[PDB]
Scaffold this active site. Structure first.
Site, PDB file in Angstrom:
ATOM      1  N   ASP A  10       0.964  -1.144   0.070  1.00  0.00           N
ATOM      2  CA  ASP A  10       0.202  -0.043   0.055  1.00  0.00           C
ATOM      3  C   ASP A  10       0.987   1.432  -0.027  1.00  0.00           C
ATOM      4  OD1 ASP A  10      -2.380   1.457   0.394  1.00  0.00           O
ATOM      5  OD2 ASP A  10      -2.124   1.347   2.638  1.00  0.00           O
ATOM      6  N   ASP A  12      -0.526   5.073   0.963  1.00  0.00           N
ATOM      7  CA  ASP A  12      -0.806   6.088   1.997  1.00  0.00           C
ATOM      8  C   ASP A  12      -0.602   5.307   3.359  1.00  0.00           C
ATOM      9  OD1 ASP A  12      -1.239   8.490   0.516  1.00  0.00           O
ATOM     10  OD2 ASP A  12      -3.240   7.458  -0.112  1.00  0.00           O
ATOM     11  N   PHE A  18       0.657   9.999   4.846  1.00  0.00           N
ATOM     12  CA  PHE A  18      -0.611  10.854   4.731  1.00  0.00           C
ATOM     13  C   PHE A  18      -1.065  11.417   5.973  1.00  0.00           C
ATOM     14  CE2 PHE A  18      -4.386  11.345   2.157  1.00  0.00           C
ATOM     15  CZ  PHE A  18      -5.470  11.719   3.152  1.00  0.00           C
ATOM     16  N   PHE A  44     -10.639   4.792  10.124  1.00  0.00           N
ATOM     17  CA  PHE A  44      -9.837   5.046   8.752  1.00  0.00           C
ATOM     18  C   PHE A  44     -10.033   6.378   7.980  1.00  0.00           C
ATOM     19  CE2 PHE A  44      -9.052   3.917   4.212  1.00  0.00           C
ATOM     20  CZ  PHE A  44      -7.674   3.766   4.517  1.00  0.00           C
ATOM     21  N   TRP A  45     -11.265   6.913   8.137  1.00  0.00           N
ATOM     22  CA  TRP A  45     -11.741   8.046   7.518  1.00  0.00           C
ATOM     23  C   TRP A  45     -11.622   9.032   8.162  1.00  0.00           C
ATOM     24  CZ3 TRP A  45     -11.598   6.239   2.919  1.00  0.00           C
ATOM     25  CH2 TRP A  45     -12.200   5.080   2.673  1.00  0.00           C
ATOM     26  N   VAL A  46     -10.330   9.945   7.914  1.00  0.00           N
ATOM     27  CA  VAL A  46     -10.236  10.957   8.693  1.00  0.00           C
ATOM     28  C   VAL A  46     -11.409  12.180   8.598  1.00  0.00           C
ATOM     29  CG1 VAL A  46      -8.716  13.265   8.268  1.00  0.00           C
ATOM     30  CG2 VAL A  46      -7.720  10.975   8.103  1.00  0.00           C
ATOM     31  N   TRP A  65      -6.513  17.338   1.136  1.00  0.00           N
ATOM     32  CA  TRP A  65      -6.075  16.454   0.182  1.00  0.00           C
ATOM     33  C   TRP A  65      -6.535  16.279  -1.232  1.00  0.00           C
ATOM     34  CZ3 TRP A  65      -8.676  14.109   4.845  1.00  0.00           C
ATOM     35  CH2 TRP A  65      -9.630  13.826   4.760  1.00  0.00           C
ATOM     36  N   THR A  99      -2.559   0.978  -4.594  1.00  0.00           N
ATOM     37  CA  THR A  99      -2.995   2.368  -4.094  1.00  0.00           C
ATOM     38  C   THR A  99      -4.444   2.769  -4.609  1.00  0.00           C
ATOM     39  OG1 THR A  99      -2.444   4.670  -3.622  1.00  0.00           O
ATOM     40  CG2 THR A  99      -1.438   3.779  -5.729  1.00  0.00           C
ATOM     41  N   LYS A 134      -9.134  -3.294  -4.107  1.00  0.00           N
ATOM     42  CA  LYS A 134      -7.852  -4.005  -4.147  1.00  0.00           C
ATOM     43  C   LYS A 134      -8.123  -5.495  -3.793  1.00  0.00           C
ATOM     44  CE  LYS A 134      -5.492   0.047  -1.945  1.00  0.00           C
ATOM     45  NZ  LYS A 134      -4.390   0.007  -1.154  1.00  0.00           N
ATOM     46  N   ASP A 145      -2.536  -0.283   5.827  1.00  0.00           N
ATOM     47  CA  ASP A 145      -3.014   0.145   7.017  1.00  0.00           C
ATOM     48  C   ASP A 145      -4.560   0.164   7.102  1.00  0.00           C
ATOM     49  OD1 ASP A 145      -2.927   2.178   5.144  1.00  0.00           O
ATOM     50  OD2 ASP A 145      -3.208   3.739   6.559  1.00  0.00           O
TER      51      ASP A 145
HETATM   52 CL   LIG Z   1       3.864  13.667   4.841  1.00  0.00          CL
HETATM   53 MG   LIG Z   2      -3.355   3.035   3.182  1.00  0.00          MG
END
Ligand SMILES: [Cl-]
Ligand SMILES: [Mg+2]
Ligand SMILES: [Cl-]
Ligand SMILES: [Mg+2]
Lengths: 198, 198
Positions: A10, A12, A18, A44-46, A65, A99, A134, A145
């Site tokens: 992976d 990020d 990230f 996982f989701w910022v 982003w 990715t 994926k 991650d």
């Molecule tokens: Cl960075």
């Molecule tokens: Mg990742």
């Protein structure tokens, strides 16, 4: 080097930082807004965590982003470039970088290719797979991650074993046995690969 | 619609008219150079045939598809958009667009996403897989104009059956039985899919 063990790596959270890049640019752009320190990241989701923090902050987070140069300027994780170069040089081992782009595609695909060229060289561009799903990429291992990888993906039974790479957002998570972690690139990734070899 | 039959649909030569777009832009930019009419195209690599035609013409040919807007401005093949929309709406059928970028990555990845958005809509962006090695993508079928698909790819035994989609460069080729062709989107693609279903 090229039946070879095939490892999907992976980008990020595994190769590129990230979470730290995001936080730094978020605080710089929005100095008057609250933020989530890395140790406090959960999920996982910022943007979801930011959205709970204050109204409108999901959209602000996204805008970081979506900006030009966000992906290109991410710093490599400690040991990542060195480990993946070594991994790719091993006998009977094929390495792909797998990715998922963000939804806004003006910059992110391009910048991911450019990032790989910068750290791994032109010849490694051949090894990039960009996909939102994926589970349709076959391999022996996926080092990633994201905890929930199937999400849901189109392939109910991926060929790869998912090895969870530690990140701030997942470090406290208990996994269902026999799921495994790679704690950092300093950890023994060779042993994980070797466990999958004939 | 989402075990589903999974179909990988190639982009250049299947959805997008690379050969015709290339020739038109080549003749416009280089009006004093010889060219290869589509009926005379032979071999997958355009630049190789041009390079044999006259010294320096390989580099000139390359410069056409490296240019901004080349990929974005490709016209769809007859019936392609309609067929893939219908295919994606079928019961127990998952469709991915599986495409290989060129080596120069400034424009091509971006423009391929933009092209898919334009013809298939935002939601279909989820279905794109960008890779130079299609053998690592698992599926039941791969509909692709390239004759030699393994090239060599990292997976010696892909999961998909390769159905050769007719293009000017491959139309005279005799295939080794039991390899099959899809002659155009007017041809009976549903029958090909149905032959792979349980
Ligand atoms: Cl960075
Ligand atoms: Mg990742
Ligand atoms: Cl065209
Ligand atoms: Mg093609």
């Amino acid at each position: 080097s090229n039946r070879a063990l095939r490892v999907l790596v992976d980008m990020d959270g595994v190769l590129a930082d990230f979470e730290g890049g995001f936080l730094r640019k978020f605080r710089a752009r929005f100095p008057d807004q609250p933020f989530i320190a890395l140790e406090d990241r959960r999920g996982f989701w910022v943007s979801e965590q930011y959205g709970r923090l204050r109204p409108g902050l999901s959209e602000k987070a996204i805008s970081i982003w979506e900006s030009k140069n966000f992906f290109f300027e991410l710093e490599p994780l400690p040991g990542a470039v060195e480990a993946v170069k070594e991994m790719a040089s091993l006998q009977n081992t094929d390495v792909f970088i797998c990715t998922s782009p963000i939804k806004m595609f003006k910059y992110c695909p391009y910048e991911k290719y450019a990032w790989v060229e910068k750290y791994f060289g032109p010849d490694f561009l051949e090894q990039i797979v960009l996909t939102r799903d994926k589970t349709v990429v076959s391999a022996d291992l996926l080092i990633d991650d994201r905890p929930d990888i199937t999400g849901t993906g189109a392939e109910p039974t991926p060929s790869w074993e998912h090895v969870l790479f530690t990140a701030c957002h997942n470090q406290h998570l208990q996994l269902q046995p026999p799921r495994r972690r790679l704690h950092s690139w300093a950890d023994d990734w060779k042993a994980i690969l070797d466990s999958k070899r004939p």
